[PDB]
Amino acid sequence: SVVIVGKISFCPKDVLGHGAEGTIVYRGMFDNRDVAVKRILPECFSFADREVQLLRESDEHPNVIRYFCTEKDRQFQYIAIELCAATLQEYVEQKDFAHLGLEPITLLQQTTSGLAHLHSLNIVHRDLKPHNILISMPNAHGKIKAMISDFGLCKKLAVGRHSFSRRSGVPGTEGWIAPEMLSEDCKENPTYTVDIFSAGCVFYYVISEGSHPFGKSLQRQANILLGACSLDCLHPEKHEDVIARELIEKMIAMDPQKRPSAKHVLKHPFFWSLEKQLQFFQDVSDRIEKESLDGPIVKQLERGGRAVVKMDWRENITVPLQTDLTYKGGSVRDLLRAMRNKKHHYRELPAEVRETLGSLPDDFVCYFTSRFPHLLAHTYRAMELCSHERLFQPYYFH
Amino acid sequence: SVVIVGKISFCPKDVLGHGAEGTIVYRGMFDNRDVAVKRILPECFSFADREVQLLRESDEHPNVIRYFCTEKDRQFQYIAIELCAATLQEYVEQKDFAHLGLEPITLLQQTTSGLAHLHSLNIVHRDLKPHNILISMPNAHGKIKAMISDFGLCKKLAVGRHSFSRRSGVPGTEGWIAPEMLSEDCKENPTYTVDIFSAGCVFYYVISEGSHPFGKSLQRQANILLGACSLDCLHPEKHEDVIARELIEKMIAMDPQKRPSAKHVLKHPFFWSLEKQLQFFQDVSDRIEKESLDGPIVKQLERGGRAVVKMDWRENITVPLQTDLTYKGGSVRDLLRAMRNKKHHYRELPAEVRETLGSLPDDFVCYFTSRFPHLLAHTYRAMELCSHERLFQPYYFH
């Protein structure tokens, strides 16, 4: 039996999910389109009217769920939206990541894009979690994407307003709520960074493949208020986990002013390709070639640098490279200068030294980041002194 | 009096345009959304059903017009689509381009993106013209975009099929039809490149601010069959017009096999920023630094190079630069090598030589392209020998 309510037509046997306030999501059709149909009770005709309104004006972004139509009835209201393959929670729980490549990070970047779009419209989502981050059906080329959904808790801030009050509405979903939303003694109103806190937990939830920065369910919201978090799944001497830790640590910071904006997150090396990482290394190496060794930029770069280059980086690179090399082995700047030269003079390098480096640019940059897993993170943090310069606009945001 | 036909609700006093087969476009509403409403006669219930179907499956791209809904009536069918500010024709005719910057080129790039999206779905538009290229309403940040519309003439090719037949359907709109659609003696079926031909004319129509490669209305379709075209608005010694001419000439080529694909067009330096143009010059200069002077790549680059560098490029650059310079003045390769050095050693350059060059990277690259308006086009054509190499993937397509 296929219920029809105007242009929306769904079958009640095809249930897809349920939500708070006893709303049920069914599969259906709208205009020869396969859609997901939300059924709304008369006790949420405002929860729906606010969600549909904000969805109508932010669904322009490809990483915001596409809204089609709402048909009101005699006892109900219905919401037609884009039909998705799964939620992000079901994705992490049921997919083998060994066969997915960089896709989990792409979903995180797409989620951040849609979040930055909402923030650019003065809209704070306030309830970001894996459950309401949806995975699209594969398109004609077999590609999928993530999309923000569930706009029932989100607020539009007035133009000019930086923040909003705690007292209005439920604080969110337990276990993903920024601590400033619940802490008893909070002298500062919540702002757009509550979404960055939730996003930070989602980031760890995806790359840890199911864990939470603040522990298991029963504790995590109380750990959030205590600030008791741990990122154990990130190995401290693996280049990728070091990069992710640097980002995630800032996103879930207790101080909301320390959390990056969504536009800062989109610029973080957590999303850079190997090619872009090698370009960053070449860009700062060119930038500091004629910079004084006791100037501000070189000082910051060498600050704590001996641990980065592992006392003597000349003793930590393969023998074929050790040969053809004046370089201070404790200098981060001199390690980058070696990489700048080996990349530039790569075509003219001996075969066995091009061999151990690998192919430009992917294997070449992995040669160094795998041996010095803190080099990129340390350099990215130090070279923030030039984030305003035109040359580094690809790498920072301002 | 506001007519209501279900979810679609428009007012007949708010007419926006008319179309062939006596269809009229009105302003209206669909779901608290401002939309444009097409009214369809019973003699186009197939012209509509095919357009709505192809629009339903390609409106995912931001540069394809967004389709909302169709309500059928007792004597009519109605099409709800995104409400646009103007057509591209009205844009070229009524806007002062001095106050628009690079926007007309952005509209051309967005139009090409949406066209490449259609071609990637095996859909040939077959009727691309300024009239049915729509300009969006400005978004929340005041930005506009172009969108393809009018899918009534477009065909979905079966998977595998390279072409389609002339005999089916009207050939298009007179004055924008590829010559293979009308020429009496044509031994080769039309293919996706009919859209590239139309797009090429649209390109000239926008940058010439109203002219056509094939002359005025009464002649142009007959000039198309004769191949009698002229691009008079493109000055032969201005860097931008030389780049545009190189692209437009290939897009409107009589041989359809010589017309670039939409993905090739998107890669052409016609769309490169000044920064990207300077990066191309640096990339080929690095690429050919240790290449033999009598090797294939350097031979192609110097082929016809004396006219590019104007006999002696050392006599065509300002005096402050002439000083601090071993360089063969008839060599395109040596002109690029000079630019590679002045960019690399820019911070360490004398003040008056940094002055005449200008700021990196915009004024620096314009210093050379303005003095040698064929340098980029000639180098781009010659360096196609490396289009397959990873380093040049930003600049070509393959």
Residue numbers in the entry:
A (entry chain A), B (entry chain A): 562 to 886, 891 to 963
From the paper:
IRE1 integrates multiple functional domains into a single ER-membrane-spanning protein. The association of the lumenal domain promotes dimerization and oligomerization of the cytoplasmic kinase-RNase tandem domain. The cytoplasmic domain has been shown to self-associate via different surface contacts, where a back-to-back (B2B) configuration is believed to fulfill the essential structural requirements for RNase activation.
We determined the crystal structures of G-9807 and G-1749 in complex with IRE1-0P at about 2 Å resolution. All structures show IRE1 as a B2B dimer, with extensive overlay of the RNase domains, but some differences in the kinase domains, especially in the conformation of the activation loop and αEF-αF loop. In IRE1 apo structures and IRE1 in complex with allosteric activators, D620 and E621 of one monomer form salt bridges with R627 and K706, respectively, of the second monomer, while in the AMG-18 structure D620 has flipped outward due to the helix unwinding, hindering hydrogen bond formation with K706 and interacting instead with the backbone of A701.
